[PDB]
Amino acid sequence: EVSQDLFNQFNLFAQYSAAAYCGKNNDAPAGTNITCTGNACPEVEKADATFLYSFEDSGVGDVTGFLALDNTNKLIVLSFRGSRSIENWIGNLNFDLKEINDICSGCRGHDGFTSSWRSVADTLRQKVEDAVREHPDYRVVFTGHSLGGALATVAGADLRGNGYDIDVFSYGAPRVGNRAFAEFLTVQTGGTLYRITHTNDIVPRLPPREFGYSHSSPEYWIKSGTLVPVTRNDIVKIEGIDATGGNNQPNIPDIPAHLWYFGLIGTCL
Amino acid sequence: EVSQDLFNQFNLFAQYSAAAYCGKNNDAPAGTNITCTGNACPEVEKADATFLYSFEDSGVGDVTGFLALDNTNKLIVLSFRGSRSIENWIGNLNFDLKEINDICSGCRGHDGFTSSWRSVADTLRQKVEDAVREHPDYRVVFTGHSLGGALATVAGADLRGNGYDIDVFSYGAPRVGNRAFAEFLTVQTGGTLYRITHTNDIVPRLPPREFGYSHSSPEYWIKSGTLVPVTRNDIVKIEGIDATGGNNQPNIPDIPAHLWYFGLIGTCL
Numbered sequence: 001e002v003s004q005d006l007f008n009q010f011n012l013f014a015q016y017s018a019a020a021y022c023g024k025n026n027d028a029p030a031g032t033n034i035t036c037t038g039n040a041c042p043e044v045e046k047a048d049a050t051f052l053y054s055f056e057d058s059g060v061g062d063v064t065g066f067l068a069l070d071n072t073n074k075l076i077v078l079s080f081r082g083s084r085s086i087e088n089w090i091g092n093l094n095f096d097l098k099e100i101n102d103i104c105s106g107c108r109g110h111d112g113f114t115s116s117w118r119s120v121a122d123t124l125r126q127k128v129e130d131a132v133r134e135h136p137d138y139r140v141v142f143t144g145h146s147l148g149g150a151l152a153t154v155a156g157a158d159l160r161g162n163g164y165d166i167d168v169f170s171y172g173a174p175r176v177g178n179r180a181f182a183e184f185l186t187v188q189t190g191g192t193l194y195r196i197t198h199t200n201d202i203v204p205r206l207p208p209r210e211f212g213y214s215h216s217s218p219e220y221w222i223k224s225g226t227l228v229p230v231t232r233n234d235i236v237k238i239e240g241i242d243a244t245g246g247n248n249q250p251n252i253p254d255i256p257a258h259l260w261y262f263g264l265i266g267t268c269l
Numbered sequence: 270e271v272s273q274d275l276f277n278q279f280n281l282f283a284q285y286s287a288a289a290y291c292g293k294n295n296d297a298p299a300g301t302n303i304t305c306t307g308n309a310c311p312e313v314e315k316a317d318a319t320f321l322y323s324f325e326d327s328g329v330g331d332v333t334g335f336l337a338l339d340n341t342n343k344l345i346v347l348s349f350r351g352s353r354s355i356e357n358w359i360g361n362l363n364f365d366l367k368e369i370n371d372i373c374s375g376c377r378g379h380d381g382f383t384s385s386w387r388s389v390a391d392t393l394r395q396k397v398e399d400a401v402r403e404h405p406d407y408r409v410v411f412t413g414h415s416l417g418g419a420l421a422t423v424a425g426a427d428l429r430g431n432g433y434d435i436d437v438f439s440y441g442a443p444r445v446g447n448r449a450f451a452e453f454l455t456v457q458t459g460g461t462l463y464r465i466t467h468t469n470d471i472v473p474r475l476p477p478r479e480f481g482y483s484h485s486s487p488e489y490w491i492k493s494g495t496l497v498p499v500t501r502n503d504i505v506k507i508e509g510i511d512a513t514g515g516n517n518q519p520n521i522p523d524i525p526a527h528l529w530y531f532g533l534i535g536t537c538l
């Protein structure tokens with residue numbers, strides 16, 4: 001059981017994370033309303049939310065996502081889409097840890113995520129600041145599903161410190177880094193990382209701890225099943241780096257559980 | 270507000286329609302438990318439910334589906350899959366009538382449906398009759414979603430009046446034939462047709478009716494949104510051939526609403 005308010009935020013950013021796949025903005029100009037196909041993001045449509053910047057297949061990693069102003073909730077939101085085909089993207093996933101000391105002292109992190117962010121990091125950083133300046137009063141939030149979780153977590157760990165909190169809401173994110181990097185995220189200040197996982201979603205179970213990866217604490221763990229609605233009572237905060245009895249159990253994982261975070265995500269009806 | 274029990278029947282049959290797509294049926298051995306991926310058919314899995322006869326790409330409209338034995342609910346259930354990819358099925362939808370006076374005289378139903386049915390119709394009626402025999406007190410139900418709903422609602426009228434009732438539960442069914450057809454379906458005894466609709470589903474609005482199609486009465490019409498759970502007070506009974514106030518209304522149709530009948534249907538997580 002989490003608090004209602006936190007349960008609301010988790011839903012909200014789950015729907016901003018879903019809008020990265022199902023909003024209509026392939027080339028949608030800055031200022032237009034954020035709407036989705038398939039009722040993927042109704043809490044968003046109900047706010048006065050608009051794009052500040054849409055992006056797609058950008059830089060080295062072919063990153064995709066958008067920047068939203070939310071007047072109703074007073075947020076600036078950076079939402080990163082996961083992979084367009086999660087099953088293949090799971091299958092082509094290398095386990096290669098890299099040196100991350102530009103971010104932190106002795107932090108190992110996965111090579112492709114660290115890589116993709118840097119490629120776009122400057123062009124987007126510039127674009128948060130501009131809005132953070134324009135609406136100094138609004139909470140910055142980075143969020144994302146799946147790959148998107150990874151990206152978001154890494155941009156957040158990377159752009160904090162500059163005098164405005166960045167909160168991160170991740171959904172079914174993969175492990176990002178080595179136990180020190182984990183540690184850096186568990187303890188880092190300038191914001192909170194909210195690491196959300198569902199049941200035996202598999203993506204969070206990768207890469208394996210037996211390739212040295214760890215999970216930043218803490219974990220918010222959705223127990224209710226696939227296709228089941230979520231209530232504040234089905235979420236468990238699990239304390240402790242690489243803890244177990246959350247998602248991190250030695251039962252068999254599942255891919256459907258990964259596309260069910262407070263509703264459909266990773267896909268579009 | 271439908272009754273609790275009819276509601277339970279709606280759900281269960283929705284789930285048998287969903288199992289057409291998401292079951293591990295392929296051609297599995299008869300007597301295997303029925304199970305689905307993606308939490309798609311839990312009420313089926315809860316029941317002592319086992320395949321009797323599987324089929325894949327059978328006859329002259331690659332009809333796919335299964336025949337099931339459910340000792341818990343006392344059912345013999347024939348469930349026909351709709352199209353493997355629907356939007357592509359909708360696009361190439363041929364609007365050609367044909368005559369099937371061997372069902373009702375002066376009746377003309379969609380050539381493509383009747384034609385795929387007839388081609389497999391024997392082999393199945395045998396398989397059903399077989400199963401009615403070893404389980405005489407079991408209720409025979411035909412079910413389906415979308416073009417599976419078509420086949421079920423046709424294999425219906427054709428196989429009725431041979432001693433045994435045949436209920437038909439259809440979910441987002443297209444029109445299947447001419448107004449002569451509507452009445453025969455609307456009045457026919459020894460089995461009642463529960464034609465279920467959601468919001469603006471597209472598949473039920475085709476064919477248009479200016480190709481010469483009408484709709485049987487009554488209509489059961491789910492008024493709750495896409496990705497919203499259905500309660501009893503979200504279902505509305507709708508009467509009169511081709512009446513309106515349900516799916517059949519003048520607004521824009523949606524593909525997504527077609528994929529949400531009590532849960533996810535027409536697609537597998």
Ligand SMILES: *[C@@H]1O[C@H](CO)[C@@H](O)[C@H](O)[C@H]1NC(C)=O
Binds near residue numbers: 033046047048
């Ligand atoms: C955008 O939404 C605002 C308020 O949230 C609304 O007033 C306006 O009509 C919308 N624009 C369009 C094109 O719907």
Ligand SMILES: *[C@@H]1O[C@H](CO)[C@@H](O)[C@H](O)[C@H]1NC(C)=O
Binds near residue numbers: 302315316317318
């Ligand atoms: C099939 O289900 C029955 C009861 O519904 C159960 O007793 C049996 O264990 C199941 N078979 C398998 C292989 O799970």
Ligand SMILES: O=Cc1ccc([N+](=O)[O-])cc1
Binds near residue numbers: 018041263495496
């Ligand atoms: O976050 C995914 C999601 C799925 C369905 C819905 N919904 O429409 O309720 C919202 C969000």
Ligand SMILES: O=Cc1ccc([N+](=O)[O-])cc1
Binds near residue numbers: 274277312
């Ligand atoms: O899956 C539960 C269930 C409950 C009632 C019925 N019925 O009464 O038809 C069928 C299934």
Ligand SMILES: CCOC(=O)CC(C)=O
Binds near residue numbers: 086
């Ligand atoms: C092969 C999976 O497709 C993609 O990678 C798309 C993406 C990275 O967003």
Ligand SMILES: CCOC(=O)CC(C)=O
Binds near residue numbers: 353354
């Ligand atoms: C559009 C109908 O869907 C199909 O079954 C096409 C196929 C892969 O054989």
